[PDB]
């Protein structure tokens, strides 16, 4: 008897895994590396695979930005 499974709630933790990775990786590869979303999303939980799409939304919608002037949240 250790860990009999014991991952019902854990999904909190599910996302902010898939989080930081679909951050990690939006950045990584918009901003400075061909990092492959793909295989990120081979080692992310499926349960939060549209969340590592919307992680990636929301980061795209900053990659948007990116280099020469980065984020403008501001209206013109």
Do not use: E
């Given at each position: 008897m250790l860990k009999n499974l014991a991952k019902l709630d854990q999904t909190e933790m599910d996302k902010v895994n898939v989080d930081l990775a679909a951050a990690g990786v939006a950045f990584k590869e918009r901003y400075n590396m061909p990092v492959i979303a793909e295989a990120v999303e081979r080692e992310q939980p499926e349960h939060l695979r549209s969340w590592f799409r919307e992680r990636l939304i929301a980061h795209r919608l900053a990659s948007v930005?990116?280099?020469?002037?980065?984020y403008e949240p501001k209206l013109k």
């Open positions: 930005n990116l280099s020469r002037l980065p």
